[model samples]
Target: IREDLDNYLNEMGEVTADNIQTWLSGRILLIENAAQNIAINPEPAAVASLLEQKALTSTFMASYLGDATGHFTIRPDAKMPDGFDPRVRPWYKGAESSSTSTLTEPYIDAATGQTIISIATAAKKAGQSVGVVGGDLSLQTLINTLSAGMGYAFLVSADGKILVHPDKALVMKSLKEAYPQDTPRISSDFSEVTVDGKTRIVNFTPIKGLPSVNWYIGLSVDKDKAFS
Candidate 1:
């Protein structure tokens, strides 16, 4: 995805602080714009206009503000939550901490309860850090990308937190909690384990470019089903 993003950014031609709207419109779902104190030109309403326009284009898109002074244009009637700070959000923090693009661990959206992940990269102007620019991808959309033939597949963090699962209630919960009696053994690479009294082939791999966070994709299938 980052490779594709790089191609997208390169193909888009010149990028500037003023034309962030165009960059975002190309692929990203949200752009933090910049730190509120930085004082960007064209007023907050102009930024709001771009956000609203993009939101109208994508069903899953929602823009947010991370600066101390919260400002957003998710909907015409959308109100900026008091005390909201985008800098502290997972998406912003993940991008800010990494030199390259980063993908955040899945978290439940407070507004919609949908599992979501953010792909973020720092945006700069005049060789100085402006803020984070990134996009949101729904976990459901990612789950649908997987081919669950014999059994099923999902994502989990190193600490055993389930990031993606068929059962909505299982998300954000620990794998141990889901399979208390038979917690699947974990490894940095693919391995096999027993779950629910059945021998299952389980494999896990780290998600590239997110070493700061030990996030991994896990796949599991019944051994008999896989062999047969």
Candidate 2:
């Protein structure tokens, strides 16, 4: 959302608290919607439509779990340990820390097996906290969108760990593990490398504006397939 968010500033006049509050209001509305719906209906009945409606507008959300008194995640045949609570999670607690909303750092998801972040807000009733509503954004989705049109896109952390790649197995490895001779580091810089005995170009761009995340969106490909 860097460029999209960057657009949100250039056109909106300023990056003021008032503007962020407007965005915060929308998130609170989402919290209110879920809290009100769950209070009036059973979880299975309420969440079925809730998740679908959210998917309509929040197509990027990977999956959802919550603190709806008795919480559960959405999935095909979902399972979790007895009495698990979303309140215990970083996103929920972080959101609860604020009067408005909070965004989380990238975290590995247990169910989806991808690095994701949560934009979360507390669901309060009469000025007291009751539950939480959190938004999920897969890091892969961000990188895919950022690196669109490239030969082969990948995302890595500042520490050189591969976070996203076409080959899922590669995610379990680091850039240093495969290519120890040289590393791209983290910047809007390009480097030449010999990957698999073939010359390849690795162009990397560090994502800006997020203080919590240190990441880069990159493309690695042989010159034959590299994009102009």
Candidate 3:
């Protein structure tokens, strides 16, 4: 199935915008590397260790992942750091909406009142249970990370809804709407349309490289203006 899919995508010029889903699916290969490590030793401790490594590495790799701000959640509801909450997991229950990984619409967390993304993944081993690992990526850090190196970069959801930016507080408080009508559609980048007066450049990537569900990455850069 993997080889067949790759062949189909390759033959069809799947690297283009209309074929973004094809390339986006290719990113699932990232999970294979992580899963292979888990298969070698599926011990809970090993799983925990792997997750911890990912959390730490993710922090350093991405601006939003944060050095000491993020954490991993496993099955049976492990204890989290004080003041943190688990109410965000409820959004993970759903079907994939796009051909590539799904991109969930951004929503304000009722608990923290912060914008968050619940990156969910199914456990490998049986009786291992289905769990979603969420990263409460710091919005401020994301702005600094993605925008610092080059032209202003701002991330939005599949439908061009604003996800994170340098002026997060202003963006969040603004009455302007920034989400698609349905909020669940995982597929290739079919078209690019303006939303909320922002001309966005959309690039589709996997949502943290996990298998199952319709969650992919949406990278946007605002070249016309500067971020404060």
Count of residue pairs whose backbone atoms collide, per candidate: 1, 0, 14
TM-score of 1: 0.63
Residue-wise lDDT of candidate 1 within 81-165, one digit each (tens)? 4665667678777777876655677766544566687666565545455555545667776566442255665667888898777
| Candidate 2: C-alpha RMSD after superposition | 8.4
Candidate 1, RMSD to the unseen true structure: 10.0
Ranking by TM-score: 1, 2, 3
Q: TM-score for all predictions?
A: 0.63, 0.54, 0.42
**What is candidate 1's CA lDDT for residue 177?**
89
Candidate 2 local lDDT, 1-228, one digit each (tens): 434433432332222223333433455456446555544543565555665574324653543546646565452324655565676777877876777656665677654666776666665656665566666667666445434332466666777787666666667468877577776554435566776777776755555443235555556766544332
Q: What C-alpha lDDT does candidate 3 achieve relative to the native structure?
A: 0.38
1 against 3, candidate with superior TM-score: 1
How much is the lDDT of residue 197 in candidate 2? 74
- Local accuracy of candidate 3 as per-residue lDDT tens digits, 1-228: 434433433333223222334433443333333344554565556656665665334442211111112234342234445665333333333211222222233556433566654332333335343233333334554455444321233444434345655557534322134434323123544223354575433344443333343333344433234121
Clashes of 1: 1
| Residue 174 accuracy (lDDT) in model 1 | 88
Give the range of the ten consecutive residues with the poorest summed lDDT in model 1. 12-21
lDDT order of candidates, top first: 2, 1, 3
Off by over 4 Å in 1: 1-46, 49-56, 68-77, 80-82, 110-113, 188-192, 209-214
Q: When superposed on Cα atoms, how far off is each prediction in RMSD?
A: 10.0, 8.4, 11.1
